[PDB]
Symmetry: C3
Subunit: 396 residues, 3 copies
């Protein structure tokens, strides 16, 4: 029972208090063994739905809209995603210079060491979008390859709804219907899973705050302000701005996106949030044609929030090492950060690799409050996707 | 052609004779290379059907019955399963004290050594019931996670058969129908696979008897009598008793369950028997709502037969080591044996670990006649499931 | 736009020229990093369709035809496959004695060494046809186990279309329809993928020719002529012959099979070609009952082209080692090469790796330092030899289907 958009807010506020307090008294362990499992059951239940929903929804949606309309949606959302992600870095740099995170600090070296995994060739990453076995792609995670096949099937069904034959048209009928059955059924499930969300949300930040809340002091606090005040501006100064521009109401969009935003914040999984991010798209009544393609692709490609975190970390490390960056170095961040634990790749691009003993001991502090910084980031990550879909949907 | 509940019995009796004799003359190898493959083809053909049947049947069954009725079935069958499994251990201990398996024996030490795999945390095992990717769960074995998703889908379909919409209700219609198609088709297959059963049943015990039949002498025979006479009592003294109590006829239940019992006995796979265990449930006309949930869950959770084997082995090892067990130690078995090659976990609970050189050399003999003991166990394992379903079904 | 059976031929002829030339100037690297990815995208897009098509098509096809008719098709196509594969070896031996590949050569020893993976027991390979988890079989490759379950399901649907019940018959209706939906949809996709074929075909042989074209000189050329002239005879002297015999027109069959043949040639994947091999079967209007069973089984079992390659290599190695083979040794090849083309895989080159099993049968194992250094040269021009082989491999399947289809 009870209005559930409040139960979540109650759980979230009450969770932060029960969190920060328990952990400060040394119950960092206690929370992990007792409370966290309830927060995990929530995450599990959401991940459960991702594969059926993304696939099933997209076959229907791609079979619903024109193969021309879809491409135009595609090119629009990508142009949108890159520009928002670029804007988010330059806004993070502005925060990292507005604040001075780790400016005066001279930290303890040689404690921790790192070796980043070197990223796979671009050619191989693009070819891998085309899956060599659909049932394989579905079986093990793999959002992007699934997206591809779902559209290739979506378009295939539509061309069968036209055949000069009756029995051909009658089979493509039932298949596209059955797939929709699943898509309908899956959305229905999230409505029930969101019922357990209060308990999950409470439990989930109860853990984040107990484990890493206490570590948010000193220079490791100034970075947190830098990230959050920056993330706030990505919402007000970039989304609210582009929503007004495109004839949408910012306030009633935030009203409708409330669930996807808090799941994304609590869960830290842009991907694990997808069923909720997607339901909220259907809630505000965006075309299944558009949102079933833009949101799963954006769950992977559009990370405005994270792109900001990468900007404000590249400045934390630079300040702690004790050498500032110029116009030619700062712009080298923005490009690499768009093109990109993968912060390890935008750190070599400026000239301070992660293997470097003192760089590595500085990054060790940052990774120490990561789950705190990553809540805010994942929310703005996900919000950025809904904003893009809403804009592309307005222009069809 | 020919009445097939006889061809199986012929194959089973003729198999034991051709088995015990061939192996006693040294053809333990010959049977393995020539006969066994035919027995394997049977097991393969049954495992083949497990995944489609369990999933497809359960979506239909859970979409058929009330979400309230199902939970009441759930709580009833679990309460039944634990109590039957508890009863089976205390009956195995009674047999292990009635007989004296390995009492006087002092066996050869240092021959064989063991190291048991330490079981995964409980928290992680319960969370793992909720699958993170259904298509994944289906792809690789995994009965329990599938069970969960099948019901979550089953309940979802039913809530779509109610929607104020026509096209929504029409898609959930076709999906639930198609899934039923599979479920219907799969049951039909087992009817043909049971046609090959005679050849398989013959071949299968021909191997068990040739390989391990000769080893059933001495103290390793007294344990076999202790297990089988004990298992006999679990059927007559526990199942026949609870069937009469609940207004079912014991004799015509054994008549209907005949196929699932002999498959389970010959095949040693409680899970591999499932398509037959399930068909026999539909044969006696139990609701697809009930049996499609109770039987696959019971295929994993309810092992009365094995729980007895664990009781009478914990006493074989104790007698061979030469120290008896008290009331506080015997009750420590019953609890751990309910809560549990996993015999290695109920052996540490009494205080005689499996790593211990002389414990390990004693367990080596027991594992030497395992396939003999395991035939009877798996039968009672599977029987116990049908009995539970029949009882819960009577009380709806 | 544009007639696409030409765009492929243009790409194929223009590819060989842009290939052989770029590689001879040292751009073997340049082609691999720039051109090949385009040829890969084609291969990827075809493999993509294999699993849905083979399964979906076969459930429909097996639910369409009589369980008696299917068995008779089964026994006919297998009898055909073995006899064609046997004929292909004895034709390869004839070419390996007609030509003398590596007769006078005495090659550099101790350069390269090999150790072949020992093949799994027959019992275990036959039992493995029956899959223990269908969804598992579908998930990871596995053509043969899928074939089995698709038929077992196909037959099951048909027995449900008969039930005294209405709601039972109505569900088996929708399921068999939905599966057909996929099967229909999947064939429709290959029609679009074949649109990208020109670019792929061009890119694909551009690579084969740049990488291995230059190595086709000397004794390594005489073997290539021996293979290709042999493969040509398998088509004219064996397929054209058996097609006429069975009241089919050879020329208009080659016309209809054109796409599957060039995909198979360019792609080197008998399995990867399957969606095209299958579409071409529906194009010439063979019963979905027959081709949906014969072609995927034949994609793995019937490798006439490869069986010839195994015959003409067993003679290249024998001549290079410097000891000829007798009647009792040559017939020991034909039997083992059939029994190893029955088990050879349907993927780029990995058939020319089971040649290691038909080399021990004559008495010259692959571990032997000078045998291994001779096989090293052969594997050096494998992608050239394997193009032709895979084409004749795939063609042989269509020929068999057409023959069995004529006799229903
Ligand atoms: Na995102
Ligand atoms: Na059981
Ligand atoms: Na082939
Ligand atoms: Na083969």
């Amino acid at each position: 029972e009870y209005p559930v958009l409040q139960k979540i807010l109650i759980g979230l506020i009450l969770g932060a208090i029960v969190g920060l307090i328990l952990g400060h008294y040394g119950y960092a362990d206690a929370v992990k063994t007792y409370v966290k499992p309830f927060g995990d059951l929530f995450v599990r239940l959401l991940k459960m739905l991702v594969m059926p929903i993304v696939f099933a929804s997209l076959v229907v949606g791609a079979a619903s809209i024109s193969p021309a309309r879809l491409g135009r949606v595609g090119v629009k959302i990508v142009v949108y995603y890159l520009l928002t992600s670029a804007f988010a870095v330059t806004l993070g740099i502005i925060m990292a210079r507005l604040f001075n995170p780790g400016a005066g600090i001279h930290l303890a070296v040689g404690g921790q060491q790192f070796q980043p995994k070197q990223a796979p060739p671009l050619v191989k990453i693009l070819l891998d979008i085309v899956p060599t076995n659909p049932f394989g792609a579905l079986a093990n995670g793999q959002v992007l390859p699934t997206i591809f096949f779902a559209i290739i099937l979506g378009i295939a069904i539509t061309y069968l709804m036209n055949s000069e034959n009756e029995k051909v048209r009658k089979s493509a009928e039932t298949l596209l219907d059955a797939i929709n059955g699943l898509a309908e059924a899956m959305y229905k499930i999230v409505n029930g899973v969101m019922q357990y969300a209060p308990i999950g949300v409470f439990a989930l930040i109860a853990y984040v705050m107990a484990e890493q809340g206490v570590k948010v002091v000193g220079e490791l606090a100034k970075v947190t302000a830098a990230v959050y005040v920056g993330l706030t501006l990505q919402i007000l100064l970039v989304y609210f701005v582009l929503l007004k521009i495109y004839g949408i109401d910012p306030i009633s969009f935030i009203k409708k996106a409330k669930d996807a935003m808090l799941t994304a914040f609590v869960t830290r999984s842009s991907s694990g949030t997808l069923p909720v991010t997607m339901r909220v798209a259907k809630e505000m009544g965006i075309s299944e044609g558009i949102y079933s393609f833009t949101l799963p692709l954006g769950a992977t490609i559009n990370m405005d929030g994270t792109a900001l975190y990468q900007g404000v970390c590249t400045f934390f490390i630079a300040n702690a090492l004790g050498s500032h960056l110029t116009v030619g170095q700062q712009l080298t961040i923005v490009l690499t950060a768009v093109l990109a634990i993968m912060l390890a790749m935008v750190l070599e691009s400026v000239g301070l690799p992660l293997t470097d003993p003192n760089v590595a001991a500085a990054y060790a502090m940052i990774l120490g409050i990561d789950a705190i910084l990553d809540m805010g980031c994942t929310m703005v990550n996900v919000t950025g996707d809904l904003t893009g879909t809403a804009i592309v949907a307005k222009t069809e």
